[PDB]
Amino acid sequence: VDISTLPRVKVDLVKPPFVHAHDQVAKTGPRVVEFTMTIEEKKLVIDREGTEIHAMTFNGSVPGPLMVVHENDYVELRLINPDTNTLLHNIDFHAATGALGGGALTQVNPGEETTLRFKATKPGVFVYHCAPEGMVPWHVTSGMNGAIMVLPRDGLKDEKGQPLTYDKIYYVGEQDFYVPKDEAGNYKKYETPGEAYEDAVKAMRTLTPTHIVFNGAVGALTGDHALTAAVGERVLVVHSQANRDTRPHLIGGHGDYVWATGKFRNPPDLDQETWLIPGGTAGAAFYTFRQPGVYAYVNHNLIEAFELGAAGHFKVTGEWNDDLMTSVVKPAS
Amino acid sequence: VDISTLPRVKVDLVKPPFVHAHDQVAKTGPRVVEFTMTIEEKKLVIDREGTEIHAMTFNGSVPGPLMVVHENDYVELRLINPDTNTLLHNIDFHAATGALGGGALTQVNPGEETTLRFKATKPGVFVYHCAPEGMVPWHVTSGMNGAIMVLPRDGLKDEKGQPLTYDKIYYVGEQDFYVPKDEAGNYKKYETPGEAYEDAVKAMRTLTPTHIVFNGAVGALTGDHALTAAVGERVLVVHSQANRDTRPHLIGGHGDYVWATGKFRNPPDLDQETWLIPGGTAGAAFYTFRQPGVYAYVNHNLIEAFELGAAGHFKVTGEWNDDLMTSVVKPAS
Amino acid sequence: VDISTLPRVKVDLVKPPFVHAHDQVAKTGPRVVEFTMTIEEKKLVIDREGTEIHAMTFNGSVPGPLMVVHENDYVELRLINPDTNTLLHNIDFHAATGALGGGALTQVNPGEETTLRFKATKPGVFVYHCAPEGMVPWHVTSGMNGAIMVLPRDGLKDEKGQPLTYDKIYYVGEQDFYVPKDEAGNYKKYETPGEAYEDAVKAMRTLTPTHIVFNGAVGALTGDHALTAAVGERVLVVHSQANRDTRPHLIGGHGDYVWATGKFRNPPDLDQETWLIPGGTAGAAFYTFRQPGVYAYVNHNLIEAFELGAAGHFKVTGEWNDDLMTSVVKPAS
Ligand SMILES: O=N[O-]
Ligand SMILES: O=N[O-]
Ligand SMILES: O=N[O-]
Ligand SMILES: O=N[O-]
Ligand SMILES: O=N[O-]
Ligand SMILES: O=N[O-]
Ligand SMILES: [Cu+2]
Ligand SMILES: [Cu+2]
Ligand SMILES: [Cu+2]
Ligand SMILES: [Cu+2]
Ligand SMILES: [Cu+2]
Ligand SMILES: [Cu+2]
Questions:
Q1: Where does the record place the Plastocyanin-like domain (chains A, B, C)?
Q2: Can you tell me the distance from the alpha carbon of C120 to that of C149, in angstroms, rounded to the nearest whole number?
Q3: Does residue C236 belong to any structural domain of this protein?
Q4: A118 plus A128 within the same structural domain
Q5: For residue B305, what are the domain limits?
Q6: Which of B7, B291, B314, C218 is 20 to 30 A off residue B214, Cα-Cα?
Q7: A175 shares its domain with A59
Q8: Which residues of A are known catalytic residues?
């Protein structure tokens, strides 16, 4: 096919956990879907203590933004590495086929840009991440990862082939950080990336994250940034982990339909309490809220959730159903 | 519905790995199934060395007892925290919907009780655990967790829709403990829970259990407490892990039908050697014994099994089948 | 049945990642398939630094060789422990039923041999490993493990029941090693196995591998030992991990059909980016190559891959498809 005969549509990305507007069921034939991302190296405070790291981001956030296309669209990414950055970067899409997912074709030094195109031949949610040869885990675990959703052209289906339509979608990126520590246990600090590299490697080799966070920091998805829904709304939560296993759980709810390893040609698992998303994968869970109130959304290694940071909240509006749950006798002497 | 028009049935719980009597296929319409549990803080010796911890239990055991109901029954739990305990506790059921699984409605100080009711709308095995705000992993990893089984009203089914009926059922709760260590590696000790809390947190944050045990102690499911079966018997083993991944394996057997993430509306996985139960989940495996003798039932991280405690035994009675396995030439020079 | 009336076929094993010749669809009725393995304790250099360990092998390799039979064949293994070895060994097949998978019947001291027969009643890929009572994880994590493939008699099938036929097969054994370290972090060394045992146990109990490798060493499946394919070829990659979870990923490709927990009566998962093989399991992934070039095949904990050793390469010959992927604008200022 002459790709130049296809429609082009430019997407304007949004910061996680929000997701750019899209159609679940494709309203057009295949398209070339145009995205641009600008790499930003920046300092980020990641915990309540004020611990500050040198993050490596796509488009200024950890995680990078969720990209959404349909199966057999073409993804055309302009990747910009401004001269205000100091490292070489690239991008690997797990959705793509060939050239290490794109990494072999997208190496950009500061002051360079590149444009990659690939055909999104398989439906699912997929990780994307930076992957410069010899320095891969350092870039990934500095926050340089996100996800892409490739919807089936006729949207999502349940285990019986009937439609599933979400009302809202959120993208939760989970990030394991490995902040080097001195022998006494305090975080070290470093003056340039090259002076940091050996201690970064040492810290990674412990296989013990110092922080595990959603949307780039402890508490990022709480308070005025809690996720929201109403009773009766259908919500899809896309969750990715580019480097390490996680086990998401909606405290007070379920995954009514879960693609734990993220690939929509497979039937979803029903009624999950918790599911395993392997490191290097994106998963997706569909839930219809039935009760109002505060929910916690966590990695259900509860240490990882409540001591290391892998916990967010939903605030859900609506009516309470006492048939589904009630306090018969409130706590009393 | 007026729940007061429904039958009430009081269950009398039993200590794991045994399971209270129940019917696989529901012999009545929906019921309110009444349970009572009394929280007990107690010292427990967990290994052969004599290491003693301050455990936090439901009904005196680690794990707490298995509760069994059918889909769309109501679970009505009276939870008692006697004044001989010193901490605040609550309960979260992963089977339930709303109020963080019940935790937001069941906070009981010593000397208090409460009664919670919820509708068991989804079939499967599910974790329950204590979850007091700000102290969640400490209570869970002190042993304060168990499981609940919500059977389909017409019992279990295989991947083709035909019945699966177990002859025996056992509940294996697997517990990761994080016993604080001094720099030399010996377990520390503490005089009150509040004096222990910071070191407990420190120990948890290593993400490295000091002990991983079945039924509350190294060797608990061995010797005179080994699990038992006969050749030809159909056995369901429910396995839960409230905080950390495990990978069960019957040494010498298989999981003929496994719901690794525990939810019975999904078809089981067939012929598993090993399966992954994510932390925060209950799973269930169905096996028909074909050979007599000693079996080991383990977490198949064999370090976790044989060095940290996650190993039990079956003793199986009956005839040996030499067609299925035989020593053709016994070991010899 | 009188097994003595069945055909006997002797297999001549090959060193991983290659696999002995076999038929996907069975060309005969059930057979007794005869294998012989000779245990070899040997020194192995496992990393680029020259770190040398005392490995425990089946047939001289880590992993041991892949054995291939069909469902309801009998596997008859002659296991030889020459008098040039110093330890007791045995074998457990996860494919087998009874006697701890064979371990209770195959204990051989140096200078002894034994012959075990079992019926391969369940199709799938399965782990085999040494398992001497009281010393199990030490033998396994010294490299004493491999896998066996039990093919359905009519070969592999997709999720719809139509045939899947591979053109090439490779066996990737992934090994976690626990090389004891001194307080400063250097690997220790030891003069006999018994003098090594306590420090080996200590090192294992950290649950933190020092090395995680494919085919027995860092870089073993790279360079002149890279895996190979051509565009359009259908490749099955069998992957095992006898002790610890892994999450394989073909960088630049997919698992088109994956049996993550290895058992062929289940439908495969489609279009996987990454899958979880639990410790104690073998899995298998089927892929049809669509692009030429270098691929990396990794455990997608990228620390485990690129810093600890769990990475190999494919070199794929053929035509580049610019419709599937192209650089629209190569990197430039
Ligand atoms: O289910 N909450 O930990
Ligand atoms: O890959 N499906 O969950
Ligand atoms: O299969 N037993 O380790
Ligand atoms: O959730 N089913 O295994
Ligand atoms: O997808 N490669 O890390
Ligand atoms: O066990 N089947 O992937
Ligand atoms: Cu980068
Ligand atoms: Cu990747
Ligand atoms: Cu408690
Ligand atoms: Cu929970
Ligand atoms: Cu051995
Ligand atoms: Cu085993």
A1: 1-169, 170-333
A2: 10
A3: yes
A4: yes
A5: 153-319
A6: B291
A7: no
A8: 89, 92, 94, 129-130, 139, 144, 249, 273-274, 300
